[PDB]
Amino acid sequence: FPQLCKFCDVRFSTCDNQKSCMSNCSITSICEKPQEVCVAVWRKNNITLETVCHDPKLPYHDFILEDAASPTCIMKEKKKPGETFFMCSCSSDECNDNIIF
């Protein structure tokens, strides 16, 4: 059965130094494949937060989702060069509304 994990794409965020910030996204989606999974990425130059629904076999941003089955999203640095880069992945339904660091 397909998940709902938020698909609000790239957005400018007030997320900063707090342990956990909420996706202020207005749309909850019915993921296009039952296999899929949400991810939330929070790249820090200003800061953009990205929330989509994704597939655990496919790589995102040339990275691969190893904790894709975890029930609540958790961000770890992926050390993309030149930027602060964080990513996570859900197995729950609209996981990536609350990001935990």
């Binding site: 709902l4 698909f7 794409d9 749309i27 909850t28 989606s29 019915i30 993921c31 296009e32 629904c53 339904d93 609209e94």
Partner: protein, 65 residues
Amino acid sequence: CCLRPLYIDFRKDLGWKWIHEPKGYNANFCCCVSQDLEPLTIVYYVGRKPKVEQLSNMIVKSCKC
């Protein structure tokens, strides 16, 4: 056995998280059984695609005893 007014707020009562808008609607509740129903137009997303569709049997109208 006369019609009645009730309000329902998808996320906070039915528990449906997939509906984008509306947040709720007024369906009515009728013992007296519901006679006539009608559909509710709603909006929701499959991935990022937004789509429109009527959900039939959402709004009650006539009551029959």
